[PDB]
Amino acid sequence: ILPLNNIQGDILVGMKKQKERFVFFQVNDATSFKTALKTYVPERITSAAILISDPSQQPLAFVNLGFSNTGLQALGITDDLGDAQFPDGQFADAANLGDDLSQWVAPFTGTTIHGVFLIGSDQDDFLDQFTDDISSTFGSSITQVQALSGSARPGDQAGHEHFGFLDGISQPSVTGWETTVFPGQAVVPPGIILTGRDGDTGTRPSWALDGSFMAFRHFQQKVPEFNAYTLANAIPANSAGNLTQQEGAEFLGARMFGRWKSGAPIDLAPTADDPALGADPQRNNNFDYSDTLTDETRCPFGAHVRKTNPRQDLGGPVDTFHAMRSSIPYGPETSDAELASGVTAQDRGLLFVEYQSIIGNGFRFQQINWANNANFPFSKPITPGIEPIIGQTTPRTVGGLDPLNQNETFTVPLFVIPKGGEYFFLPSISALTATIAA
């Protein structure tokens, strides 16, 4: 049984708050930081247990805390955590991910960042109150080098990311606790997500039990450009009949993602949106590509969700490459004038968060081995190509987007720009005080 009171809640349950702030910091004084941390943790650090408690018993803000390798070093915590990528940091790994390094910005361009406080709350003012509480408690023991703040989109776009698609539908379920499991949801041993638990194969210090590694990515999105691209390349028809340009553009977007904007998976709804299905957690994940392993009519081989979770393209259930996501959009809505121009005029995007016990098996495997690999999934009659949303290999050519002309290739401009990121370790709540602050 997992000790839910000891696991940082964003890892297992997800904050699911309307607003979130990532406060990136450096440690200035290890001794002063450690005593501040011992004060802070029992008061503010939110467990999985709290996140599944009655909302009345919940605090106004949830706080979680992760450390980079240099943060652990600054604190004299020098035990090897057993991950191949964590020690060097993400900037050193960015070229491997396919990133254009010229688009990276401070303070991510190095290993200056020692950690991140994640604050989830209902309003920006509450984020400010909890940020000020960090300032008051830690004082000059830290320097806040950057804060990145996000917000759920308004109205019926709540839960949707900036291109318009419902995000946060498909997550693995870990064994070791009692929770609801939906049809089609992968059930994995807890060590796929939690370091030191069954299923983890990395060599972990005992104090690393029930922690997890976060891959953080700051993505800027080019929404008018995406919209204009789908209009310019609108699919003329599908199996059900001819499409108006607007229908064909919406369909092309769905083909790129593998889901309609509503969340309806195209493997179940291959020709038209089914918003009732999109909003149905009991059915919106109940598919595995077994009905489309050797053709692309129902779903392209290279659609976002199929690349990042290949399901039956792997030949059966595989524990190893599942990961939890707790991303949040940021920035203003895209104006009518922006969409008309087809050109981005404001900074908006995704503060992307993915948790796994082995960075190389979760985020990094999904990115490099799968999304960036034109020849993945394997053994297909048409080359899948590069995942159109986040695949980084050039040329960004993907096949099969038009179900009636599957050999047609699309060369897709990059609409998602990495601006920085880092690899963090989130310890257990007890480890925060018993180890990190010792």
Ligand X SMILES: *[C@@H]1O[C@H](CO)[C@@H](O)[C@H](O)[C@H]1NC(C)=O
- Residues at the binding site for heme b are 168-170, 259, 304, 309, 311, 325
CB 424 within 8 A of CB 113: no
Within 182-221, which residues bind ligand HEM (CB under 6 A)? 217, 219, 221
Phi, psi of 321 (to 5 degrees): -110, 15
Q: Compare residues 262 and 428 and give the one whose CB is closer to ligand HEM.
A: 262
DSSP 392-406: --SS-EEE--STTST
Which residue number, 312 or 393, has a Cβ lying nearer to ligand 3DM?
Answer: 312
* Of 34 and 259, CB closest to ligand HEM: 259
Q: What is the smallest separation between the CB atom of 271 and ligand X, expressed in angstroms?
A: 15
Out of 83, 99, 167, 313, the active site residue is 167
Give 119's strand partners.
Answer: 21, 63
Q: Is 386 in the site for ligand HEM (CB under 6 A)?
A: no
- Among the listed residues 22, 301, 363, 410, the single contact to ligand HEM using CB under 6 A: 363
Site mask, ligand 3DM, residues 369-398, x = CB under 6 A? ----------xxx-----------------
Per DSSP, helices labelled H in 79-222 are 94-97, 124-138
Binders of ligand 3DM in range 301-340 (CB under 6 A): 309, 311-312, 314, 317-318
Rounded CA-CA distance 243/255 in Å is 14
Q: How far is the CB of 12 from ligand 3DM (least distance, A)?
A: 18
For residue 430, give every residue at least 6 positions away whose Cβ sits within 8 Å of its Cβ, in sequence order, or none. Answer: 6
CB contact at 8 A, 417 and 222 = yes
| Torsion from C-alpha of 268, 269, 274, 280, nearest 10 degrees | 10
Is 165 an interacting residue with respect to ligand HEM (CB under 6 A)? yes
- Residues in 231-270 at the binding interface with ligand HEM, rule: CB under 6 A: 257, 259
Residue 236 contact among ligand HEM, ligand 3DM, ligand X, none, beta carbon within 5 to 8 Å by kind: ligand X
Active-site residue flag, 200: no
Partner interacting with residue 250 (select from ligand X, ligand 3DM, ligand HEM, none; CB below 5-8 Å by kind) = none
Which residues make up the interface to ligand X (CB under 6 A)?
236, 242
Q: How many CB atoms lie within 10 A of CB 181?
A: 10
Pairing relation of β-strands 187-188 and 173-174? parallel
**Given phi > 0 = left and psi -120 to 50 = alpha, else beta, which region is 76?**
left
Nearest-angstrom CA–CA distance, 38 and 223: 43
Among 356, 357, 367, 433, binds ligand HEM (CB under 6 A): 367
Question: Count of alpha carbons within 13 Å of 184, Cβ hemisphere only?
Answer: 21
| AA identity, residue 138 | F
Q: CB burial class (10 A; 0-12, 13-18, 19+) of residue 39?
A: middle
Q: Examine residue 154 and tell whether it contacts ligand 3DM (CB under 6 A).
A: no
**Residues engaged in binding ligand 3DM (CB under 6 A):** 184, 186, 288, 294, 309, 311-312, 314, 317-318, 379-381
**Residues engaged in binding ligand HEM (CB under 6 A):** 161, 163, 165, 167-170, 217, 219, 221, 257, 259, 304-305, 308-309, 350, 352, 354, 363, 366-367, 389-390, 416
